[PDB]
Amino acid sequence: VNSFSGYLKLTDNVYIKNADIVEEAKKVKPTVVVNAANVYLKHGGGVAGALNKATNNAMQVESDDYIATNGPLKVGGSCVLSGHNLAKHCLHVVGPNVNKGEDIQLLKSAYENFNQHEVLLAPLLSAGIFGADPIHSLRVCVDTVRTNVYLAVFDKNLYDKLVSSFL
Ligand SMILES: CCc1c[nH]c2ncnc(NCC(C)(C)CC(F)(F)F)c12
Ligand SMILES: [Cl-]
């Protein structure tokens, strides 16, 4: 039993809700919140900009030190950093950004990072400003993630379409 509330169950392990991931993280304080990161951990907009803003830019400060030490992530890769005031940990995961021309096949690799964590609060990878089809991203999530994932979909219209079109 966990503290996530109001989710619709899609499969044995995948759950979904119309929610602002920022507000959801603040309420649940999950062990892991997933960020829709880029390789430079520059948290400018989309989910990343919103999460960082909620940390009062502490996520960005920590991220800049991470990059200065380690260099950029790989597309499809991830790193674990602090969750600040939102969660114990933040798993920064880089899905491909279609608006940069990146290979959509890397979306599966991106979701594989979730399997290293038993329970996660997450957005749909590569959706929103990353330019992928959110319906496809959900299909890849369900077919790749085996651990327990609670998906937050900000857009109510999109949430309804995701549920109504789910196979
Ligand atoms: C600023 C963005 C954002 C803040 N809080 C969030 N929580 C969840 N998902 C988010 N964005 C991903 C979507 C849901 C695919 C974006 C889209 F497609 F609907 F426009 C956000
Ligand atoms: Cl977005």
JSON list of C-alpha atoms and ligand atoms in Angstrom, two decimals:
[
{"chain": "A", "resi": 1, "resn": "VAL", "atom": "CA", "xyz": [0.00, 0.00, 0.00]},
{"chain": "A", "resi": 2, "resn": "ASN", "atom": "CA", "xyz": [1.26, 3.47, -0.96]},
{"chain": "A", "resi": 3, "resn": "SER", "atom": "CA", "xyz": [-0.02, 7.05, -0.69]},
{"chain": "A", "resi": 4, "resn": "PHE", "atom": "CA", "xyz": [-0.86, 7.76, -4.35]},
{"chain": "A", "resi": 5, "resn": "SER", "atom": "CA", "xyz": [-4.54, 8.69, -4.66]},
{"chain": "A", "resi": 6, "resn": "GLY", "atom": "CA", "xyz": [-7.06, 9.03, -7.47]},
{"chain": "A", "resi": 7, "resn": "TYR", "atom": "CA", "xyz": [-5.13, 7.11, -10.14]},
{"chain": "A", "resi": 8, "resn": "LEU", "atom": "CA", "xyz": [-6.69, 4.94, -12.82]},
{"chain": "A", "resi": 9, "resn": "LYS", "atom": "CA", "xyz": [-5.06, 1.51, -13.09]},
{"chain": "A", "resi": 10, "resn": "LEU", "atom": "CA", "xyz": [-3.95, 0.72, -16.64]},
{"chain": "A", "resi": 11, "resn": "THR", "atom": "CA", "xyz": [-2.00, -2.50, -16.03]},
{"chain": "A", "resi": 12, "resn": "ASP", "atom": "CA", "xyz": [-0.56, -4.57, -13.19]},
{"chain": "A", "resi": 13, "resn": "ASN", "atom": "CA", "xyz": [2.09, -1.89, -12.61]},
{"chain": "A", "resi": 14, "resn": "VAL", "atom": "CA", "xyz": [1.12, 1.34, -14.47]},
{"chain": "A", "resi": 15, "resn": "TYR", "atom": "CA", "xyz": [-1.28, 3.95, -13.07]},
{"chain": "A", "resi": 16, "resn": "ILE", "atom": "CA", "xyz": [-2.34, 7.35, -14.46]},
{"chain": "A", "resi": 17, "resn": "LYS", "atom": "CA", "xyz": [-3.92, 10.60, -13.26]},
{"chain": "A", "resi": 18, "resn": "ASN", "atom": "CA", "xyz": [-4.72, 14.10, -14.50]},
{"chain": "A", "resi": 19, "resn": "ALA", "atom": "CA", "xyz": [-2.42, 16.04, -12.20]},
{"chain": "A", "resi": 20, "resn": "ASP", "atom": "CA", "xyz": [0.30, 18.66, -12.07]},
{"chain": "A", "resi": 21, "resn": "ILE", "atom": "CA", "xyz": [3.40, 16.61, -11.24]},
{"chain": "A", "resi": 22, "resn": "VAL", "atom": "CA", "xyz": [4.69, 19.53, -9.13]},
{"chain": "A", "resi": 23, "resn": "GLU", "atom": "CA", "xyz": [1.58, 19.59, -6.94]},
{"chain": "A", "resi": 24, "resn": "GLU", "atom": "CA", "xyz": [1.48, 15.79, -6.83]},
{"chain": "A", "resi": 25, "resn": "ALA", "atom": "CA", "xyz": [5.10, 15.55, -5.69]},
{"chain": "A", "resi": 26, "resn": "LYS", "atom": "CA", "xyz": [4.60, 18.17, -2.97]},
{"chain": "A", "resi": 27, "resn": "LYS", "atom": "CA", "xyz": [1.60, 16.26, -1.62]},
{"chain": "A", "resi": 28, "resn": "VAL", "atom": "CA", "xyz": [2.95, 12.71, -1.82]},
{"chain": "A", "resi": 29, "resn": "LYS", "atom": "CA", "xyz": [6.68, 13.35, -1.25]},
{"chain": "A", "resi": 30, "resn": "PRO", "atom": "CA", "xyz": [7.48, 10.18, -3.22]},
{"chain": "A", "resi": 31, "resn": "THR", "atom": "CA", "xyz": [10.75, 8.34, -2.94]},
{"chain": "A", "resi": 32, "resn": "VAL", "atom": "CA", "xyz": [11.41, 9.13, -6.62]},
{"chain": "A", "resi": 33, "resn": "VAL", "atom": "CA", "xyz": [10.06, 11.86, -8.88]},
{"chain": "A", "resi": 34, "resn": "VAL", "atom": "CA", "xyz": [11.12, 11.62, -12.53]},
{"chain": "A", "resi": 35, "resn": "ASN", "atom": "CA", "xyz": [12.23, 14.75, -14.36]},
{"chain": "A", "resi": 36, "resn": "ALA", "atom": "CA", "xyz": [11.90, 15.14, -18.13]},
{"chain": "A", "resi": 37, "resn": "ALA", "atom": "CA", "xyz": [15.54, 16.19, -18.40]},
{"chain": "A", "resi": 38, "resn": "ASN", "atom": "CA", "xyz": [17.87, 17.13, -21.22]},
{"chain": "A", "resi": 39, "resn": "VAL", "atom": "CA", "xyz": [21.51, 16.02, -21.44]},
{"chain": "A", "resi": 40, "resn": "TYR", "atom": "CA", "xyz": [22.76, 19.34, -20.02]},
{"chain": "A", "resi": 41, "resn": "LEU", "atom": "CA", "xyz": [20.30, 19.28, -17.10]},
{"chain": "A", "resi": 42, "resn": "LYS", "atom": "CA", "xyz": [19.19, 22.77, -18.18]},
{"chain": "A", "resi": 43, "resn": "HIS", "atom": "CA", "xyz": [15.75, 22.90, -16.61]},
{"chain": "A", "resi": 44, "resn": "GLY", "atom": "CA", "xyz": [14.22, 25.68, -18.66]},
{"chain": "A", "resi": 45, "resn": "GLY", "atom": "CA", "xyz": [10.64, 24.70, -19.46]},
{"chain": "A", "resi": 46, "resn": "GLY", "atom": "CA", "xyz": [8.13, 21.92, -19.61]},
{"chain": "A", "resi": 47, "resn": "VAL", "atom": "CA", "xyz": [8.14, 19.55, -16.66]},
{"chain": "A", "resi": 48, "resn": "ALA", "atom": "CA", "xyz": [11.80, 20.33, -15.89]},
{"chain": "A", "resi": 49, "resn": "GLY", "atom": "CA", "xyz": [11.28, 24.07, -15.73]},
{"chain": "A", "resi": 50, "resn": "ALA", "atom": "CA", "xyz": [8.26, 23.60, -13.46]},
{"chain": "A", "resi": 51, "resn": "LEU", "atom": "CA", "xyz": [10.00, 21.16, -11.10]},
{"chain": "A", "resi": 52, "resn": "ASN", "atom": "CA", "xyz": [13.07, 23.37, -10.87]},
{"chain": "A", "resi": 53, "resn": "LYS", "atom": "CA", "xyz": [10.96, 26.47, -10.21]},
{"chain": "A", "resi": 54, "resn": "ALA", "atom": "CA", "xyz": [9.26, 24.66, -7.33]},
{"chain": "A", "resi": 55, "resn": "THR", "atom": "CA", "xyz": [12.71, 23.96, -5.78]},
{"chain": "A", "resi": 56, "resn": "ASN", "atom": "CA", "xyz": [13.53, 27.69, -5.90]},
{"chain": "A", "resi": 57, "resn": "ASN", "atom": "CA", "xyz": [16.29, 26.88, -8.46]},
{"chain": "A", "resi": 58, "resn": "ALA", "atom": "CA", "xyz": [18.09, 24.48, -6.08]},
{"chain": "A", "resi": 59, "resn": "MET", "atom": "CA", "xyz": [17.63, 21.69, -8.64]},
{"chain": "A", "resi": 60, "resn": "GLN", "atom": "CA", "xyz": [19.44, 23.80, -11.25]},
{"chain": "A", "resi": 61, "resn": "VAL", "atom": "CA", "xyz": [22.30, 24.67, -8.88]},
{"chain": "A", "resi": 62, "resn": "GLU", "atom": "CA", "xyz": [22.81, 21.00, -8.02]},
{"chain": "A", "resi": 63, "resn": "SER", "atom": "CA", "xyz": [22.53, 20.04, -11.69]},
{"chain": "A", "resi": 64, "resn": "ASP", "atom": "CA", "xyz": [25.16, 22.56, -12.79]},
{"chain": "A", "resi": 65, "resn": "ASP", "atom": "CA", "xyz": [27.62, 21.05, -10.33]},
{"chain": "A", "resi": 66, "resn": "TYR", "atom": "CA", "xyz": [26.74, 17.56, -11.59]},
{"chain": "A", "resi": 67, "resn": "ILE", "atom": "CA", "xyz": [27.45, 18.54, -15.21]},
{"chain": "A", "resi": 68, "resn": "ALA", "atom": "CA", "xyz": [30.66, 20.37, -14.32]},
{"chain": "A", "resi": 69, "resn": "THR", "atom": "CA", "xyz": [31.93, 17.15, -12.72]},
{"chain": "A", "resi": 70, "resn": "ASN", "atom": "CA", "xyz": [30.50, 14.47, -15.02]},
{"chain": "A", "resi": 71, "resn": "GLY", "atom": "CA", "xyz": [29.65, 16.04, -18.36]},
{"chain": "A", "resi": 72, "resn": "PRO", "atom": "CA", "xyz": [26.35, 15.65, -20.18]},
{"chain": "A", "resi": 73, "resn": "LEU", "atom": "CA", "xyz": [24.05, 12.68, -19.93]},
{"chain": "A", "resi": 74, "resn": "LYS", "atom": "CA", "xyz": [23.28, 10.44, -22.90]},
{"chain": "A", "resi": 75, "resn": "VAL", "atom": "CA", "xyz": [19.95, 10.61, -24.70]},
{"chain": "A", "resi": 76, "resn": "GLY", "atom": "CA", "xyz": [18.16, 7.62, -23.18]},
{"chain": "A", "resi": 77, "resn": "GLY", "atom": "CA", "xyz": [20.20, 7.93, -19.99]},
{"chain": "A", "resi": 78, "resn": "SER", "atom": "CA", "xyz": [19.60, 9.18, -16.47]},
{"chain": "A", "resi": 79, "resn": "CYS", "atom": "CA", "xyz": [21.12, 10.25, -13.20]},
{"chain": "A", "resi": 80, "resn": "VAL", "atom": "CA", "xyz": [19.84, 10.27, -9.62]},
{"chain": "A", "resi": 81, "resn": "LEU", "atom": "CA", "xyz": [20.04, 13.60, -7.81]},
{"chain": "A", "resi": 82, "resn": "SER", "atom": "CA", "xyz": [18.27, 15.12, -4.83]},
{"chain": "A", "resi": 83, "resn": "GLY", "atom": "CA", "xyz": [14.51, 15.48, -4.83]},
{"chain": "A", "resi": 84, "resn": "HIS", "atom": "CA", "xyz": [14.88, 18.70, -2.79]},
{"chain": "A", "resi": 85, "resn": "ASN", "atom": "CA", "xyz": [11.50, 19.68, -1.27]},
{"chain": "A", "resi": 86, "resn": "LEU", "atom": "CA", "xyz": [9.55, 17.53, -3.76]},
{"chain": "A", "resi": 87, "resn": "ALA", "atom": "CA", "xyz": [10.74, 13.95, -3.20]},
{"chain": "A", "resi": 88, "resn": "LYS", "atom": "CA", "xyz": [13.59, 12.01, -1.65]},
{"chain": "A", "resi": 89, "resn": "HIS", "atom": "CA", "xyz": [15.29, 11.64, -5.04]},
{"chain": "A", "resi": 90, "resn": "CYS", "atom": "CA", "xyz": [14.85, 13.02, -8.53]},
{"chain": "A", "resi": 91, "resn": "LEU", "atom": "CA", "xyz": [15.58, 10.62, -11.39]},
{"chain": "A", "resi": 92, "resn": "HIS", "atom": "CA", "xyz": [16.55, 12.89, -14.29]},
{"chain": "A", "resi": 93, "resn": "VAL", "atom": "CA", "xyz": [15.72, 10.90, -17.45]},
{"chain": "A", "resi": 94, "resn": "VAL", "atom": "CA", "xyz": [16.53, 12.08, -20.98]},
{"chain": "A", "resi": 95, "resn": "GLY", "atom": "CA", "xyz": [13.95, 11.02, -23.53]},
{"chain": "A", "resi": 96, "resn": "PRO", "atom": "CA", "xyz": [14.61, 11.87, -27.17]},
{"chain": "A", "resi": 97, "resn": "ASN", "atom": "CA", "xyz": [13.53, 15.38, -28.19]},
{"chain": "A", "resi": 98, "resn": "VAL", "atom": "CA", "xyz": [11.82, 15.05, -31.58]},
{"chain": "A", "resi": 99, "resn": "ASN", "atom": "CA", "xyz": [12.19, 18.81, -32.06]},
{"chain": "A", "resi": 100, "resn": "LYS", "atom": "CA", "xyz": [15.97, 18.14, -32.05]},
{"chain": "A", "resi": 101, "resn": "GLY", "atom": "CA", "xyz": [15.79, 15.21, -34.50]},
{"chain": "A", "resi": 102, "resn": "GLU", "atom": "CA", "xyz": [16.61, 12.50, -31.95]},
{"chain": "A", "resi": 103, "resn": "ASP", "atom": "CA", "xyz": [15.76, 8.84, -32.57]},
{"chain": "A", "resi": 104, "resn": "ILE", "atom": "CA", "xyz": [12.39, 7.89, -31.08]},
{"chain": "A", "resi": 105, "resn": "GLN", "atom": "CA", "xyz": [13.66, 4.33, -30.56]},
{"chain": "A", "resi": 106, "resn": "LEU", "atom": "CA", "xyz": [15.68, 5.77, -27.66]},
{"chain": "A", "resi": 107, "resn": "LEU", "atom": "CA", "xyz": [12.39, 6.25, -25.80]},
{"chain": "A", "resi": 108, "resn": "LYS", "atom": "CA", "xyz": [12.45, 2.60, -24.72]},
{"chain": "A", "resi": 109, "resn": "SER", "atom": "CA", "xyz": [15.99, 2.99, -23.39]},
{"chain": "A", "resi": 110, "resn": "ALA", "atom": "CA", "xyz": [14.84, 6.08, -21.48]},
{"chain": "A", "resi": 111, "resn": "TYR", "atom": "CA", "xyz": [11.98, 4.20, -19.81]},
{"chain": "A", "resi": 112, "resn": "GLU", "atom": "CA", "xyz": [14.31, 1.31, -18.88]},
{"chain": "A", "resi": 113, "resn": "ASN", "atom": "CA", "xyz": [15.85, 3.64, -16.28]},
{"chain": "A", "resi": 114, "resn": "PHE", "atom": "CA", "xyz": [12.58, 3.44, -14.34]},
{"chain": "A", "resi": 115, "resn": "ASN", "atom": "CA", "xyz": [13.17, -0.28, -13.66]},
{"chain": "A", "resi": 116, "resn": "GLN", "atom": "CA", "xyz": [15.96, 0.61, -11.22]},
{"chain": "A", "resi": 117, "resn": "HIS", "atom": "CA", "xyz": [13.34, 2.02, -8.81]},
{"chain": "A", "resi": 118, "resn": "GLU", "atom": "CA", "xyz": [10.50, 0.10, -7.19]},
{"chain": "A", "resi": 119, "resn": "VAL", "atom": "CA", "xyz": [8.01, 3.02, -7.25]},
{"chain": "A", "resi": 120, "resn": "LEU", "atom": "CA", "xyz": [8.09, 6.32, -9.18]},
{"chain": "A", "resi": 121, "resn": "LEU", "atom": "CA", "xyz": [6.02, 9.41, -9.85]},
{"chain": "A", "resi": 122, "resn": "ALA", "atom": "CA", "xyz": [6.67, 10.34, -13.46]},
{"chain": "A", "resi": 123, "resn": "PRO", "atom": "CA", "xyz": [5.61, 12.29, -16.55]},
{"chain": "A", "resi": 124, "resn": "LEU", "atom": "CA", "xyz": [5.24, 10.75, -19.97]},
{"chain": "A", "resi": 125, "resn": "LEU", "atom": "CA", "xyz": [8.74, 10.79, -21.43]},
{"chain": "A", "resi": 126, "resn": "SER", "atom": "CA", "xyz": [9.31, 12.76, -24.64]},
{"chain": "A", "resi": 127, "resn": "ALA", "atom": "CA", "xyz": [5.78, 14.23, -24.45]},
{"chain": "A", "resi": 128, "resn": "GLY", "atom": "CA", "xyz": [4.99, 17.94, -24.29]},
{"chain": "A", "resi": 129, "resn": "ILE", "atom": "CA", "xyz": [7.79, 20.14, -25.61]},
{"chain": "A", "resi": 130, "resn": "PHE", "atom": "CA", "xyz": [9.92, 17.09, -26.45]},
{"chain": "A", "resi": 131, "resn": "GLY", "atom": "CA", "xyz": [7.54, 16.62, -29.38]},
{"chain": "A", "resi": 132, "resn": "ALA", "atom": "CA", "xyz": [6.67, 12.91, -29.29]},
{"chain": "A", "resi": 133, "resn": "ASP", "atom": "CA", "xyz": [3.17, 11.45, -29.50]},
{"chain": "A", "resi": 134, "resn": "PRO", "atom": "CA", "xyz": [2.03, 11.01, -25.86]},
{"chain": "A", "resi": 135, "resn": "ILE", "atom": "CA", "xyz": [-0.09, 8.00, -26.83]},
{"chain": "A", "resi": 136, "resn": "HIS", "atom": "CA", "xyz": [3.03, 6.28, -28.17]},
{"chain": "A", "resi": 137, "resn": "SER", "atom": "CA", "xyz": [5.00, 7.24, -25.07]},
{"chain": "A", "resi": 138, "resn": "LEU", "atom": "CA", "xyz": [2.34, 5.59, -22.90]},
{"chain": "A", "resi": 139, "resn": "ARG", "atom": "CA", "xyz": [2.53, 2.43, -25.00]},
{"chain": "A", "resi": 140, "resn": "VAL", "atom": "CA", "xyz": [6.30, 2.34, -24.56]},
{"chain": "A", "resi": 141, "resn": "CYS", "atom": "CA", "xyz": [5.99, 3.00, -20.83]},
{"chain": "A", "resi": 142, "resn": "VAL", "atom": "CA", "xyz": [3.53, 0.14, -20.32]},
{"chain": "A", "resi": 143, "resn": "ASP", "atom": "CA", "xyz": [5.61, -2.22, -22.47]},
{"chain": "A", "resi": 144, "resn": "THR", "atom": "CA", "xyz": [8.96, -1.32, -20.83]},
{"chain": "A", "resi": 145, "resn": "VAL", "atom": "CA", "xyz": [8.50, -0.37, -17.18]},
{"chain": "A", "resi": 146, "resn": "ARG", "atom": "CA", "xyz": [8.00, -3.32, -14.83]},
{"chain": "A", "resi": 147, "resn": "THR", "atom": "CA", "xyz": [8.19, -1.40, -11.55]},
{"chain": "A", "resi": 148, "resn": "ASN", "atom": "CA", "xyz": [5.27, 0.61, -10.17]},
{"chain": "A", "resi": 149, "resn": "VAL", "atom": "CA", "xyz": [4.84, 3.88, -12.05]},
{"chain": "A", "resi": 150, "resn": "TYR", "atom": "CA", "xyz": [2.34, 6.65, -11.27]},
{"chain": "A", "resi": 151, "resn": "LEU", "atom": "CA", "xyz": [2.00, 8.86, -14.34]},
{"chain": "A", "resi": 152, "resn": "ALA", "atom": "CA", "xyz": [0.89, 12.47, -13.98]},
{"chain": "A", "resi": 153, "resn": "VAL", "atom": "CA", "xyz": [-0.60, 14.06, -17.10]},
{"chain": "A", "resi": 154, "resn": "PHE", "atom": "CA", "xyz": [-1.01, 17.83, -16.75]},
{"chain": "A", "resi": 155, "resn": "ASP", "atom": "CA", "xyz": [-3.44, 18.38, -19.64]},
{"chain": "A", "resi": 156, "resn": "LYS", "atom": "CA", "xyz": [-6.95, 17.17, -18.80]},
{"chain": "A", "resi": 157, "resn": "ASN", "atom": "CA", "xyz": [-7.85, 16.93, -22.47]},
{"chain": "A", "resi": 158, "resn": "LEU", "atom": "CA", "xyz": [-4.74, 14.84, -23.06]},
{"chain": "A", "resi": 159, "resn": "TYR", "atom": "CA", "xyz": [-5.42, 12.69, -20.00]},
{"chain": "A", "resi": 160, "resn": "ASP", "atom": "CA", "xyz": [-8.91, 11.88, -21.26]},
{"chain": "A", "resi": 161, "resn": "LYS", "atom": "CA", "xyz": [-7.57, 11.03, -24.71]},
{"chain": "A", "resi": 162, "resn": "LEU", "atom": "CA", "xyz": [-4.85, 8.82, -23.19]},
{"chain": "A", "resi": 163, "resn": "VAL", "atom": "CA", "xyz": [-7.37, 6.83, -21.14]},
{"chain": "A", "resi": 164, "resn": "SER", "atom": "CA", "xyz": [-9.97, 6.57, -23.89]},
{"chain": "A", "resi": 165, "resn": "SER", "atom": "CA", "xyz": [-7.44, 5.34, -26.46]},
{"chain": "A", "resi": 166, "resn": "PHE", "atom": "CA", "xyz": [-5.55, 2.89, -24.22]},
{"chain": "A", "resi": 167, "resn": "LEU", "atom": "CA", "xyz": [-5.44, -0.72, -25.39]},
{"chain": "B", "resi": 1, "resn": "LIG", "atom": "C1", "xyz": [5.16, 22.62, -17.71]},
{"chain": "B", "resi": 1, "resn": "LIG", "atom": "C2", "xyz": [4.79, 21.17, -18.04]},
{"chain": "B", "resi": 1, "resn": "LIG", "atom": "C3", "xyz": [4.34, 20.41, -16.85]},
{"chain": "B", "resi": 1, "resn": "LIG", "atom": "C4", "xyz": [4.23, 20.95, -15.58]},
{"chain": "B", "resi": 1, "resn": "LIG", "atom": "N1", "xyz": [3.77, 19.96, -14.70]},
{"chain": "B", "resi": 1, "resn": "LIG", "atom": "C5", "xyz": [3.58, 18.80, -15.43]},
{"chain": "B", "resi": 1, "resn": "LIG", "atom": "N2", "xyz": [3.13, 17.62, -14.92]},
{"chain": "B", "resi": 1, "resn": "LIG", "atom": "C6", "xyz": [3.05, 16.66, -15.83]},
{"chain": "B", "resi": 1, "resn": "LIG", "atom": "N3", "xyz": [3.35, 16.72, -17.16]},
{"chain": "B", "resi": 1, "resn": "LIG", "atom": "C7", "xyz": [3.78, 17.93, -17.64]},
{"chain": "B", "resi": 1, "resn": "LIG", "atom": "N4", "xyz": [4.07, 17.99, -18.98]},
{"chain": "B", "resi": 1, "resn": "LIG", "atom": "C8", "xyz": [4.02, 16.84, -19.87]},
{"chain": "B", "resi": 1, "resn": "LIG", "atom": "C9", "xyz": [2.75, 16.75, -20.75]},
{"chain": "B", "resi": 1, "resn": "LIG", "atom": "C10", "xyz": [1.52, 16.49, -19.88]},
{"chain": "B", "resi": 1, "resn": "LIG", "atom": "C11", "xyz": [2.96, 15.65, -21.78]},
{"chain": "B", "resi": 1, "resn": "LIG", "atom": "C12", "xyz": [2.61, 18.15, -21.43]},
{"chain": "B", "resi": 1, "resn": "LIG", "atom": "C13", "xyz": [1.46, 18.31, -22.47]},
{"chain": "B", "resi": 1, "resn": "LIG", "atom": "F1", "xyz": [1.65, 17.52, -23.54]},
{"chain": "B", "resi": 1, "resn": "LIG", "atom": "F2", "xyz": [0.23, 18.00, -22.05]},
{"chain": "B", "resi": 1, "resn": "LIG", "atom": "F3", "xyz": [1.37, 19.55, -22.97]},
{"chain": "B", "resi": 1, "resn": "LIG", "atom": "C14", "xyz": [3.93, 19.05, -16.79]},
{"chain": "B", "resi": 2, "resn": "CL", "atom": "CL", "xyz": [5.96, 19.66, -21.42]}
]
